[PDB]
Amino acid sequence: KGEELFTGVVPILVELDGDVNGHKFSVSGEGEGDATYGKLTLKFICTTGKLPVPWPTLVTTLVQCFARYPDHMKQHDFFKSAMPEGYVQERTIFFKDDGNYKTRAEVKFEGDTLVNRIELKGIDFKEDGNILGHKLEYNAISDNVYITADKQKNGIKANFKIRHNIEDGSVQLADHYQQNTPIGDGPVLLPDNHYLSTQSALSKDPNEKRDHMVLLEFVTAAGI
Numbered sequence: 001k002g003e004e005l006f007t008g009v010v011p012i013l014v015e016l017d018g019d020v021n022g023h024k025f026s027v028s029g030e031g032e033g034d035a036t037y038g039k040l041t042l043k044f045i046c047t048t049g050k051l052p053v054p055w056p057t058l059v060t061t062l063v064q065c066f067a068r069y070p071d072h073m074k075q076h077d078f079f080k081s082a083m084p085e086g087y088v089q090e091r092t093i094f095f096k097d098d099g100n101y102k103t104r105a106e107v108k109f110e111g112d113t114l115v116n117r118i119e120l121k122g123i124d125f126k127e128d129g130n131i132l133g134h135k136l137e138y139n140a141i142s143d144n145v146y147i148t149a150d151k152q153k154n155g156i157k158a159n160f161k162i163r164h165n166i167e168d169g170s171v172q173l174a175d176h177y178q179q180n181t182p183i184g185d186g187p188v189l190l191p192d193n194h195y196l197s198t199q200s201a202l203s204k205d206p207n208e209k210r211d212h213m214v215l216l217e218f219v220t221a222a223g224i
Contacts, residue, residue, distance in 0.1 A: 002083035003074070006035040006065065011113045012042060014062050020122030021099070021132060023052035029062055031215075033114065035080070038068030040217040045210050053122070054136040055213040056164055059200050060176060061091070061103050063116050064145070067196050067219040076191035076224065078147075078156045078180065084109035085184030087155070096173040099125030108183060130164070130172045137165040138202055144222075145178075145196040154188055155181040194223040 014029030031042030044055075044062060051058075065079035079087065086108025093101040105118040125132050141162050150157045158178035163171045182188050196219050203214040 003080045014116045016118040018120035021125045033066035038219045042215045044213045069221040081189040082182045091178045094175045098129045139165045142199040149190040153181045
């Protein structure tokens with residue numbers, strides 16, 4: 001029944017509250033998802049002023065229910081099967097030689113709108129590292145999200161790496177560990193091992209003076 005909620009274009013709202021090394025901030029996002037094409041278009045605004053971390057480091061945190069699952073893999077789509085009640089998504093994100101983010105999000109429908117409500121806590125960051133020093137390029141990210149079942153939680157786990165370009169030509173690795181658990185008590189689809197091929201293009205609205213990010217993203221399941 002959850003998959004039927006994604007056959008057309010679905011409005012998306014994202015709300016994040018964060019604290020990284022004591023720097024508190026909030027982000028609000030709005031956009032649309034079209035799972036038929038695995039396509040997401042969103043604009044995010046820092047509602048508290050200036051974002052204290054680089055926008056690219058928040059992309060993965062800021063709705064994998066919008067993935068395009070090929071017909072032959074649709075029985076492996078945990079994310080839609082949890083809807084409309086939703087799922088809790090938790091991550092730890094280890095920035096190599098720097099701090100970590102720990103995130104908890106609730107992803108669910110509020111009426112016809114798919115909502116991603118997030119809390120983010122970052123600790124152990126270096127004052128003059130790539131994150132708090134804002135040394136990362138405003139650059140796209142792309143990678144594969146490796147998904148496995150977590151029967152014990154009636155959910156899934158995932159792992160993946162993001163390579164963020166640094167301004168000097170080097171790379172800041174962000175190792176992601178993820179867990180998803182359903183909010184409701186209904187049956188869900190527990191998948192065989194597979195991946196999500198994900199690509200995010202980042203841009204700016206030339207007329208927008210608030211600190212913000214425009215995002216175009218494609219997400220497609222594969223590996224079966």
